[PDB]
Chains A and B, each alone.
Chain A
Amino acid sequence: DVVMTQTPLSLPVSLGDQASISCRSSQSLVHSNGNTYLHWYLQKPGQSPKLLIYKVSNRFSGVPDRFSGSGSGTDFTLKISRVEAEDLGVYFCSQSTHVPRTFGGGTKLEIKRADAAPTVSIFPPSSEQLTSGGASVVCFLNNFYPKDINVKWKIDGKERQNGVLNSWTDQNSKDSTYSMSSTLTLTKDEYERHNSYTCEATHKTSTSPIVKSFNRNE
């Protein structure tokens, strides 16, 4: 088992710029037949890996020349001459010189773009859910950058920490932004005992928190 070691683990890089991912192996990857079987793959979220470079520097069908590979023995580099917004994903180096075949740990390509404010939307529980005695109030904080953001739920001005579920999307390949949904779940009973529900977000793009509330009188 040949250990493949990738560096760095994550790589923030702006569109247009150059990017290089490194990969070291525990043993030389040169086969007794002269060839060096070091390859490179890209895996986009929810998809299977896709081959870019095989045998150090050859490109797979349709792969563009912005991608070049280089290296020798145990050290290898994958270079992207100029980064597009579609390059984001995880990159793995793999070897098939030695049995068993081994993959690296991956390097996540993160696109650095301009700061963007999240557009928040607040949704009250649906009649259909109330009917079952449950009540989830939801908050979407869409299309923002950086990923760093804070959300506080407030009921009649009182902060609620328990019962909130937070989920973030991977960086969007379309505009390099992130989205997040924060769900506060209550009983139908507790929901009915109050008036205004507030979703408060704290992001570096705003001095004051970005706020979204609804009062039960719609």
Chain B
Amino acid sequence: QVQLQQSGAELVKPGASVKLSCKASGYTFTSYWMQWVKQRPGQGLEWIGEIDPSDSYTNYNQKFKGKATLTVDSTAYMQLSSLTSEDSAVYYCANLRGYFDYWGQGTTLTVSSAKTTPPSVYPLAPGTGSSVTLGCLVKGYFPESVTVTWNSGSLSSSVHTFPALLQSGLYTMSSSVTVPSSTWPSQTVTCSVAHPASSTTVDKKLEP
């Protein structure tokens, strides 16, 4: 299986630089050129450039001539420079050639002077019915994102993950799960919250 492994998140101060990586597995790294694409919330994607692993020969889109530089070897790298709030986006490495089309997971790039802040996790348990909806409020963290799983992600059929909103310059989000009413509280459900940016993993057990 061909696999392009990327980072995940990056917080950087304005005016700073940064260098993303892309490990190429599952194929002969040297056979295809490596591409880089940028994507900001407003879905539109923008092509940055490409590099030929065999000779490390390069090709760039003009708009990024003065922003990015690529290098290789089975890893490919792209470096950005003089970051600004507009540079905040998801960056992707990918082999884009006809039917050999493989994208990496994208590295989220957050350019901010803000302090990395860990999330506070509060359990939401009801104050009647065939089903009971429980929840977890993940308040006050930075930067994005967070990953809420239930019963370590073994309870995944009725989950709702609500997108994070900015509240006082800090993010807030919630997650919910619905289970048969006869199973809680007899059985316990727990939400696991992961905030890698602050190397955090908290578990919250839901009790009446």
Contacts and interface: CB of A to CB of B under 8 A. Distances in A.
A82 B145 CA distance: 35
Given A102-B47, A165-B167, 7 more contacts: A49-B103, A54-B98, A101-B47, A122-B126, A169-B161, A179-B160, A185-B167
A57 interface: no
A169 B163 contact: yes
A58 B101 CA distance: 13
Given A106-B44, A138-B124, A140-B176, A54 B101 contact: yes
Contacts of A50: 103
Contact of B123 (A54, A102, A126): A126
B172 interface: yes
Nearest to A197: B127
A183 B137 contact: yes
B123 A128 contact: yes
Contacts of A123: 124-127, 135
Interface in A173-191: 179-181, 183, 185
Residue of B45, B173, B176 with highest tally of chain A CB at under 10 A: B45
Contacts of B124: 123, 126, 138
A167 B137 CA distance: 13
A55 interface: yes
B118 to A, nearest CB: 14
Contacts of B98: 54-55
B16 interface: no
A79 B87 CA distance: 35
Interface of B: 35, 43-47, 59, 61-62, 92, 94, 96, 98-99, 101, 103-106, 120, 122-127, 131, 133, 135, 137, 139, 160-165, 167, 172-174, 176, 178
Interface in A146-181: 165, 167-169, 179-181
Contact of B162 (A128, A169, A214): A169
B162 A142 contact: no
Residue of B43, B139, B161, B167 with highest tally of chain A CB at under 10 A: B43
Contacts of B174: 138, 140, 167, 181, 183
Contact of A101 (B96, B104, B160): B96
Interface string A89-112: 010101010011111011000000
Contacts of A94: 45
A27 interface: no
A100 B61 contact: yes
A169 B47 CA distance: 29
A142 B124 CA distance: 15
Contacts of B99: 51, 54, 58, 60-61
A136 B133 contact: no
Contacts of B164: 167
Interface in A10-65: 43, 48-51, 54-55, 58, 60-61
A206 interface: no
A123 B15 CA distance: 44
Given A106-B43, A136-B137, A121 B101 contact: no
B44 A165 contact: no
B127 A181 contact: no
Nearest to A61: B99
